[PDB]
Paper text:
Myosin motor proteins are responsible for movement and force generation across multiple scales of biology ranging from muscle contraction to cell migration to intracellular transport. In this study, we focus on the MD of myosin VI, an unconventional myosin motor unique in its ability to walk ‘backwards’ towards actin filament pointed ends. Here we present cryo-EM reconstructions of myosin VI bound to F-actin in the rigor state at 4.6 Å resolution and the ADP state at 5.5 Å resolution along with corresponding atomistic models. Finally, by comparing the conformation of actin in the myosin VI-bound ADP and rigor state structures to bare filaments, we find that actin structural deformations accompany motor conformational changes during the force-generation cycle.
To monitor global rearrangements of the MD between nucleotide states, we used low-pass filtered density maps and MDFF to extend our models for the ADP and rigor state actomyosin complexes to include the converter and lever arm regions. Due to the overall lower resolution of the filtered maps, we limit our analysis to backbone motions and represent these ‘LPF’ (low-pass filtered) MDFF models as backbone averaged structures instead of a superimposed ensemble. We observe a ~ 30° rotation of the converter around an axis nearly parallel to the actin filament upon the transition from ADP to rigor. This repositioning is sterically coupled to nucleotide cleft opening by opposing motions in the SH1 helix, which transitions from an extended to compact conformation, and the long relay helix, which exhibits winding at the end proximal to the converter. As was observed in the rigor-like crystal structure, the rigor lever arm displays a prominent bend between insert 2 residues 784 and 785, which our map and model reveals to be absent in the ADP state. Based on these grafted models, bending produces a 30° reorientation of the lever arm, which protrudes off the filament axis in the ADP state but is almost perfectly parallel to the filament in the rigor state, providing a new explanation for early EM observations. The converter rotation and lever arm bending results in a ~ 35 Å displacement of the tip of our modeled lever arm, with a ~ 10 Å projected displacement along the filament axis towards the pointed end. While our maps and models do not contain atomistic detail in this region, it is tempting to speculate that bending is driven by an electrostatic interaction between negatively charged residue E14 in the proximal light chain bound to insert two and positive residues K736 and R732, which can be seen in the high-resolution rigor-like crystal structure. Our models suggest that nucleotide release is coupled to a converter rotation that licenses a lever arm bend in myosin VI, contributing to the displacement observed in previous structural and functional studies of the ADP to rigor transition.
Residue numbers in the entry:
A (entry chain N): 2 to 398, 405 to 622, 636 to 817
B (entry chain T): 3 to 147
């Protein structure tokens, strides 16, 4: 409406206040409220209606008159300076990290205050989700799941620890399992956590820490499960990225009585480390403790990497302290270093072309002493390993050896490193689960923590599997939100109603459908006698010529993406928008070739620790299918349990206390799927206010007679007086529900003509006396029917 | 079971049970309404019928549970005797009529806020025969409608 404030797109704050002083077909001439004369232009989809009272905050976001992402951004801007870091959006908890310890919130008196209290009546906190998940376990007769997203530094580690604290305090009577995850956190900071372009410490796996509950409601055990891993990162990294952190912390923290036994050298030597960044994280004090022979030329030129918490020299010490606490001796700790060092001496093995004698490939002469120092770490013979890295062993039933091509041997040598390190991380997790064996199993409350929608300027194959994992989790997110709203309307007595659902199945079919999907073409290209990346890119727009979820790079508005040639990349639209991916090295990173001749050699090792790691047809196997198959084992497990979605917000780039950046927070609202769920709720009734809320707001505008009434009869009389439309306004059981922009329309009816409103209250005065009679008459008949129940029941005792 | 028009009138009466407006009542809430309208139950007995209806395990009575807490298959004349026993809670002097003073005493005990002029206004609408007092015939035509 005219004259009414709208939100305006301001680059430094996301949205600010502003008014509309001219308009065109597609654009609005926006004049800011605080900066008059600045008068810019904005499009129809870039403006949002603002509320009249903007100085107030709400605990529950369904109490807003205008529910959008600009009024959600202003609600968490006001709450940030009131130190209210938790915010209730239906079944979604929005938690904002303050980087400081707030008083009394983690208190045990606070924990027993929340215990058993109804929902929504207590202030938002993370203990109000954990108490709800215990009650929607035992009552429901179904297991539960807490889903934690967000980027690194957003508080997703700290929110996980408060969940496990509440279960071993409020309901668990004893069981000290809570901090055994926390105490062996540096093991997963080495093995699983790596370095990405926008994050220094990022988890690259689906952490599923589950807590077993028995039928008697006691904590009987826990279990840690892991899903996904970046197979490519193990052997080849991007620009300025690192590999996993155990390949830097072992290099930085190793002593010289360990270096003589593992034959370690500086990272420049090793091909699985020199591709990316070789620098260590350190501080001034630990920079003095790093030995000269551990330093690479890049380390000499550019020095240590700066982080306030990461220290690759000092956290190797706090890793080996944690291996003493968890359950590992020094001999078993050394065997977890012999496997890591064997991977480093595998990547330097090169393959030339054979001298016409039987076809195939042979090893290079510069790779001879490098094989001798690697085969004793793997427990195998150097003459048998040379055959196994060059031949395809089969039978004619004699057993023949048929040599492989040069490119197939480079892919098979890196496939051994993507198999040994894959089973090594599964051995670390299984060893940790044997340090706290569960007593029994029945019901479970687990925490799924994984990285959010993460993307860079030029996206890789590693980020393609992350954004594909978040799209499938976005499908299940909106599926659980629609089910909660349909059983809210029934619970308030409004019954069933039609709501429009948004589908993303067409984006899923684009990526993973049989024969036509992007991962299906990628796995087929490996089978060709000559694989290409130009043939892969052209095949995507061969089979998918139409569709809106996919375009050419030149169609993008961004200049950087317009420099990409047609056969060098593609743009795939996801829930968080249009994300471009380049296709160079995509097939190479997907191609894995672990075959019989090498799979049945590392299992046959003379070393015993190596055989413990590994517990015709198919040759090259299906590599692009393992990414779909492993994810389906988690999605159907999430469908079988309840869900508790906790979205974690990072408020500023520096990660320092009391700083709000609305050009970085708004980007995480649109990359969390929060804005998508607010679009869904416009289809229903997004604005709802309890009877006590509408009594505190509107009693001053009413006559003194109507003001004397109780909140439910005050609202019932007010709804009947005005004569409101039944499809727009709905009278619930504890709340009044509204269609979009009709709580706002309601607020203007109360601010309109006092004499007209007084006359409508006069006209409903007979009905109001009759309603107030029947209220006390049927309440006295209620006490008499409960007196007749006490007698009827005690007649059968 | 109860009819749809009988559930609607008990739904407005449930706001006198639930004055806080959270949609749910405890034994601190359901006890204080019984005692304010002259009936004193013992805590053990009202716990036993809560443990019948509450399936949530929380001990908190929401509206569908409140409906099955007062429902029971009763005989035909049993029903009419409950309506007559309600009339006798309004009638304080036991003459078979409800005056303005007697109606004001039930209002104030249930917490309804109203003036002396409003009490005279209420009695006047309920009265049909013109004596200014509500006999059982006039009480049932107000209840029913």
């Amino acid at each position: 409406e005219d004259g009414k404030p709208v939100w305006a797109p301001h680059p430094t704050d996301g949205f600010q206040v502003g008014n509309i002083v001219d308009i065109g077909p597609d654009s609005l001439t926006i004049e800011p409220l605080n900066q008059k004369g600045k008068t810019f232009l904005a499009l129809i989809n870039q403006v949002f209606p603002a509320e009249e009272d903007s100085k107030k905050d709400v605990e529950d976001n369904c109490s807003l008159m205008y529910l959008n992402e600009a009024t959600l951004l202003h609600n968490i801007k006001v709450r940030y300076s009131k130190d209210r870091i938790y915010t209730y959006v239906a079944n979604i908890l929005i938690a904002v990290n303050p980087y400081f310890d707030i008083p009394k919130i983690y208190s045990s008196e606070t924990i027993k205050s929340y215990q058993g209290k109804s929902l929504g009546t207590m202030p938002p906190h993370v203990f109000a989700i954990a108490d709800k998940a215990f009650r929607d376990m035992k009552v429901l007769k179904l297991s539960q799941s807490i889903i934690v997203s967000g980027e690194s530094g957003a508080g997703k580690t700290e929110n996980t620890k408060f969940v496990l604290r509440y279960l071993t305090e409020s309901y668990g009577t004893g069981q000290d399992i809570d901090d055994r995850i926390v105490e062996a956190n540096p093991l997963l900071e080495a093995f699983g956590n790596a370095k990405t372009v926008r994050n220094n410490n990022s988890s690259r796996f689906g952490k599923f820490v589950e807590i077993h509950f028995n039928e008697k409601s006691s904590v009987v055990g826990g279990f840690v499960s892991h899903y996904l891993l970046e197979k490519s990162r193990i052997c080849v990294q991007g620009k300025e990225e690192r590999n996993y952190h155990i390949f830097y912390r072992l290099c930085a923290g190793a002593s010289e009585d360990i270096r003589e036994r593992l034959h370690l050298s500086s990272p420049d030597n090793f091909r699985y480390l020199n591709r990316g960044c070789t620098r260590y994280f350190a501080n001034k004090e630990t920079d003095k403790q790093i030995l000269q022979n551990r330093k690479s030329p890049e380390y000499l030129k550019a020095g240590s990497l700066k982080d306030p918490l990461l220290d690759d020299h000092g956290d190797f010490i706090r890793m080996c302290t944690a291996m003493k606490k968890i359950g590992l001796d020094d001999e078993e700790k050394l065997d977890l270093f012999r496997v890591v060092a064997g991977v480093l001496h595998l990547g330097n093995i090169d393959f030339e072309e054979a001298g016409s004698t039987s076809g195939g490939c042979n090893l290079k002469n510069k790779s001879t002493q490098a094989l001798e120092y690697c085969a004793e770490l793997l427990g195998l013979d150097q003459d048998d390993l040379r055959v196994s890295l060059t031949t395809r062993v089969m039978l004619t039933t004699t057993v023949i050896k048929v040599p492989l091509k040069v490119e197939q041997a480079n892919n098979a040598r890196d496939a051994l490193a993507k198999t040994v390190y894959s089973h090594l991380f599964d051995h670390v997790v299984n060893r940790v689960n044997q340090c706290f064996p569960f007593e029994t199993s029945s019901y479970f409350i687990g925490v799924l923590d994984i990285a959010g929608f993460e993307y860079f300027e030029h996206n890789s194959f590693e980020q393609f599997c992350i954004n594909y994992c978040n799209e499938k989790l976005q499908q299940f997110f909106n599926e659980r939100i629609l089910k909660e709203e349909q059983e809210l309307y029934q619970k308030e007595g409004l019954g069933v109603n039609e709501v429009h659902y948004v589908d993303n199945q067409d984006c899923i079919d684009l990526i993973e459908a049989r024969l036509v999907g992007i991962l299906d073409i990628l796995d087929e290209e490996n089978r060709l006698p000559q694989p290409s990346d130009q043939h892969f890119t052209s095949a995507v727009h061969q089979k998918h010529k139409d569709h809106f979820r996919l375009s050419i790079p030149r169609k993008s508005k961004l200049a950087i993406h317009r420099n990409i040639r047609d056969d060098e990349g593609f743009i795939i639209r996801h829930f968080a928008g249009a994300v471009c991916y380049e296709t160079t090295q995509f097939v190479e990173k997907n191609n894995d070739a672990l075959h019989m001749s090498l799979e049945s050699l590392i299992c046959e090792s003379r070393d015993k620790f190596i055989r413990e790691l590994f517990e015709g047809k198919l040759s090259f196997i299906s590599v692009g299918n393992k990414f779909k198959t492993q994810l389906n084992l988690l999605l159907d497990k999430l469908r079988s349990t309840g869900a508790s979605f906790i979205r974690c917000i990072k408020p500023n780039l520096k990660m320092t206390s009391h700083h709000f950046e609305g050009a970085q927070i708004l980007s995480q609202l649109q990359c969390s799927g929060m804005v998508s769920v607010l679009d869904l709720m416009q289809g229903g009734f997004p604005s709802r206010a309890s009877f006590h809320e509408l009594y505190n707001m509107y009693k001053k505008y009413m006559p003194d007679k109507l003001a004397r009434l109780d909140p439910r009869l005050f609202c019932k009389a007010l709804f009947k007086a005005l004569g409101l439309n039944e499809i727009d306004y709905k009278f619930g059981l504890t709340k009044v529900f509204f269609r979009p922009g009709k709580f706002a329309e309601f607020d203007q009816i109360m601010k309109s003509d006092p004499d007209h409103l007084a006359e409508l209250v006069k006209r409903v005065n007979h009905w109001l006396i009759c309603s107030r009679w029947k209220k006390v008459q049927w309440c006295s008949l209620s006490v008499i029917k409960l007196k007749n129940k006490i007698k009827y029941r005690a007649e059968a005792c | 079971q109860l009819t749809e028009e009988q559930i609607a009138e008990f739904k407005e009466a449930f706001s006198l049970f639930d004055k806080d407006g959270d949609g749910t009542i405890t034994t601190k809430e359901l006890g204080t309404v019984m005692r304010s309208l002259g009936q004193n139950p013992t805590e053990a007995e009202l716990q036993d019928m809560i443990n019948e209806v509450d399936a949530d395990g929380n001990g908190t009575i929401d509206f569908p549970e409140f409906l099955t807490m007062m429902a029971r298959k009763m005989k035909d004349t049993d029903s009419e005797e409950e309506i007559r026993e309600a009339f006798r809670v309004f009638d304080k002097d036991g003459n078979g009529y409800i005056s303005a003073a007697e109606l004001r005493h039930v209002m104030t005990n249930l917490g309804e806020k109203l003036t002396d002029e409003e009490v005279d206004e209420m009695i006047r609408e309920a009265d049909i025969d013109g004596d200014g007092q509500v006999n059982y015939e006039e009480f049932v035509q107000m209840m029913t409608a």
